[PDB]
């Protein structure tokens, strides 16, 4: 009755401001459980995530923080809104558990990927997804983990991006922890330790839009390394220009693989899988396929960007300057790309964050 409480959430325990009722799970992941709840005070339902071991490693810290920060510093109608963030512990001593609260849609894109849409829906859905990202990119922010699990739709046919716990900027490194993004969607620059640009997201975007048409994961991959082989078997071995960019160690292996020419996108994606072409030009299989072939490209330097995705004949017939080129968000300057701290030191910033964010 200390104005909080706990609920036996499946495997573990939760602790939230009484206002949140009927906590049933929906999100079981690599960042902790996330259950739906009915915020009374709000008169609308919400979702609550409980960060799993936020201080376990000097890295989780770096992610929990960015998570928070970025959830706060960035807004769009296509980015899950941060309703709140709280902690039950009273002081930094106690402090170690953080619950984040945000609006909740109706389902997962995995739910969509299991139904056949039409150019209207599919194109619109991609459009929204594309606007959501453009927002992040406009601030030099990369998501590094776009996938179905991180995209939600609601009955009114609108979608919103999710999770930022892995979201960051820059690209110095080759990703010391590339093992983190979800295999089936890793972009070539990630797989082959390379240093990514913003366009490293449009790859995942292709892997997804391809999943909505095919209805199966685009590039399977029984393991971190098999992933690559699944990519080339589809799109064919990259050219020598590309190879010349890999670390000496990676370049050699990448060159000792069998050579695949790949298959045409008309083959990878025959018409029949795409919605029914009407008679209208902009929303045709030809176009949807064309956009695909410009995202599913190994060489990042030759791969489309959001700017152009939003301008493409298939996604462009919804284009709206506001949504498209909204105002670039603005993080203070805490967010960076390297800045390392202690387990405690990090914990320090989190608290003084969870606080003025309560």
């Amino acid at each position: 009755d200390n104005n909080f409480y706990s609920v036996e959430i499946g495997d573990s325990t939760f602790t939230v401001l009484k206002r949140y009722q009927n906590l049933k799970p929906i999100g079981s992941g690599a960042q902790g459980i996330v259950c739906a709840a009915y915020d009374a005070i709000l008169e609308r339902n919400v979702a609550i995530k409980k960060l799993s071991r936020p201080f376990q490693n000097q890295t989780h810290a770096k992610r929990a923080y960015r998570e928070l920060v970025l959830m706060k510093c960035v807004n769009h109608k296509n980015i899950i809104g941060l309703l709140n963030v709280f902690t039950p512990q009273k002081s930094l001593e106690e402090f170690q558990d953080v619950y984040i609260v945000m609006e909740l849609m109706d389902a997962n894109l995995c739910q969509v990927i299991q139904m056949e849409l039409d150019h209207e829906r599919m194109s619109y859905l991609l459009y929204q997804m594309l606007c959501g990202i453009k927002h992040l990119h406009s601030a030099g922010i990369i998501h590094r983990d776009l996938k179905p699990s991180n995209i939600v739709v609601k009955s009114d046919c609108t979608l919103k991006i999710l999770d930022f716990g892995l979201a960051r900027t820059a690209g110095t490194s080759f990703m010391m922890e590339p093992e983190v993004v979800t295999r089936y969607y890793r972009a070539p620059e990630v797989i082959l330790g390379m240093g990514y640009k913003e366009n490293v997201d449009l790859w995942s975007v292709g892997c997804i839009m391809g999943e909505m048409v095919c209805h199966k994961i685009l590039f399977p991959g029984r393991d971190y390394i098999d992933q690559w082989n699944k990519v080339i078997e589809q799109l064919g071995t990259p050219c020598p220009e590309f190879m010349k960019k890999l670390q000496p160690t990676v370049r050699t292996y990448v060159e000792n693989r069998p050579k695949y020419a790949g298959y045409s996108f008309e083959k990878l994606f025959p018409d029949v899988l795409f919605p029914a072409d009407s008679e209208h030009n902009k929303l045709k299989a030809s176009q949807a396929r064309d956009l695909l072939s410009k995202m599913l490209v190994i060489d990042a330097s030759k791969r489309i960007s959001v700017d152009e995705a939003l301008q493409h004949p298939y996604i462009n017939v919804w284009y709206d300057p506001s949504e498209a080129e909204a105002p670039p968000p603005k993080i203070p300057d805490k967010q960076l790309d390297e800045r390392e701290h202690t387990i405690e030191e990090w914990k320090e910033l989190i608290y003084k964050e969870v606080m003025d964010l309560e």
Binding site: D106, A107, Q111, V112, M115, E120, R121, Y124, V153, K154, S155, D156, C157, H280, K282, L283, V317, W318
Partner: peptide
Amino acid sequence: PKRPTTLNLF
């Protein structure tokens, strides 16, 4: 060409 408003998530 107007934006959809429904989506049978069932």
